[PDB]
């Protein structure tokens, strides 16, 4: 099932002395606030941040590092198209054109393998892929760990 309110539970659960204690957290009682899922202040007071990450990609790619980028295709915050264009700009060559990857009987999403980087989309998943398409998310994880392209 899906429950869109999970953030609310987490908030409740991690704010219990019980729990913090079991985590070895907020040892002293010296964390002068309530535990929140995100830090507002931090979020509104951000400083440095480059406009592009491509140069780094280039460098790591050149380093032989394994690179995989993925996307939940029903996300509107950092949508699939943004990524397509972004990866597109690296200008890498294609080794394996856009093809559908399967999990079980269903199509899990699509994938394109470039020379030095693999791109994968997750059919039907929102921003938080492991929340919306758990099973698919895991397959992705195993493949990535293996350095093997998504299956057809």
């Amino acid at each position: 099932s899906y429950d869109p309110c999970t953030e609310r539970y987490s908030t409740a659960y991690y704010n219990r002395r019980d729990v913090q204690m079991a985590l070895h957290a907020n040892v002293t009682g010296a964390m002068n606030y309530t535990w929140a899922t995100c830090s507002d202040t931090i979020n509104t007071h951000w400083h440095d941040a480059p406009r592009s990450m491509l140069p780094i990609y280039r460098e790591l790619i050149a380093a032989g590092l394994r690179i995989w980028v993925f996307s939940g295709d029903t996300d509107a915050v950092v949508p699939l198209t943004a990524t397509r264009y972004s990866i597109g700009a690296l200008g890498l060559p294609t080794t394996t054109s856009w093809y559908p990857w399967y999990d079980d009987q269903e199509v899990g999403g699509w994938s394109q393998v470039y020379k030095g980087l693999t791109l994968v989309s997750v059919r039907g998943a929102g921003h938080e892929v492991p929340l919306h398409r758990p099973r698919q998310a895991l397959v992705l994880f195993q493949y990535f760990l293996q350095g093997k392209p998504m299956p057809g």
Binding site: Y2, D3, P4, C5, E7, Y9, S10, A12, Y13, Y14, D18, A22, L23, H24, A25, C38, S39, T41, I42, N43, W46, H47, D48, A49, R51, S52, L54, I56, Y57, L60, L65, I67, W68, F70, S71, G72, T74, D75, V77, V78, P79, L80, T81, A82, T83, Y85, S86, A89, A125, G126, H127, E128, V129, P130, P134, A137, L138, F141, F144, L145
Partner: protein
């Protein structure tokens, strides 16, 4: 490290893998300590890789998301009254390390109140690196283990940046094998573009708004938009209404 070990969390079910959590000071001067949580793979899967997972925001906790409502091992019951096991947890195959960062996020903290108004990519990266290096000293059996970095969204910045440090650094106890980013920032300009296009292509903004977005935001940064861009943005937002921008076809929470 034996000291960071979790016996059991309240409401937790019985499991067959170890978990650990605690702090690690990354700036002795400023008094910056980052909290982590590590969920390992069951023994018969050992020795598995190590994976550091990062959430974004910037300002969002990797424990809250990553570990508690995404790929971590448990899911929180309603009213935060307990846990339930996630069958699809990534720690079924890897040792997963969740990091709250930066300082001021989640359970991570700072002794220098200013820190929270002065965060940025750079410092965030240097702190993460530090954290690692020490972290390995606390968990020496992890030295040389295949290691990967990963995260979402704003972590599109984090991952590669940090991956770059690690790489330049040349610390040998760290076998970085690669990374992976999901729905993440990559290039402001392109992302802006793809972003609007997809919106218009998902029926979410009028034709005018779309055109306006292209005009307002194209020279901006994703994280520090101009006033023009913001204005365009306020409209779009109104055109979208009450849906969940992170998952278009699923329901909003009540």
């Amino acid at each position: 490290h034996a000291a960071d070990r979790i016996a059991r969390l309240p409401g937790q079910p019985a499991v067959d893998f170890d978990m650990y959590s605690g702090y690690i000071t990354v700036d002795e001067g400023a008094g910056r300590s980052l909290f982590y949580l590590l969920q390992e793979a069951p023994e018969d899967a050992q020795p598995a890789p190590l994976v550091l997972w990062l959430n974004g925001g910037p300002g969002c906790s990797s424990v809250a998301y990553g570990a508690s409502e995404e790929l971590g091992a448990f899911r929180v019951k309603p009213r935060g009254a307990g846990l339930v096991l996630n069958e699809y947890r990534w720690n079924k195959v890897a040792n997963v390390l969740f990091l709250d960062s930066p300082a001021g996020v989640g359970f991570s903290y700072t002794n220098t109140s200013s820190d929270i108004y002065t965060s940025g990519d750079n410092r965030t990266a240097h702190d993460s690196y530090a954290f690692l290096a020490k972290w390995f000293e606390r968990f020496p059996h992890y030295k040389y283990r295949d290691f990967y970095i990963a995260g979402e969204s704003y972590a599109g910045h984090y991952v590669p940046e940090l991956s770059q440090l690690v790489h330049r650094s040349k610390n040998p106890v760290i076998n970085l094998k690669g990374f992976m980013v999901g729905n993440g920032l990559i290039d402001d300009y392109h992302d802006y573009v793809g972003t609007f296009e997809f919106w218009w292509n998902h029926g979410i903004v009028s034709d005018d708004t779309y055109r306006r977005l292209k005009e307002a935001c194209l020279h901006d940064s994703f994280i520090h938009p101009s006033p023009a861009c913001d204005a365009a943005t306020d409209v779009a937002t109104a055109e979208q209404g009450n849906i969940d921008m992170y998952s278009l076809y699923t329901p909003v929470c009540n």
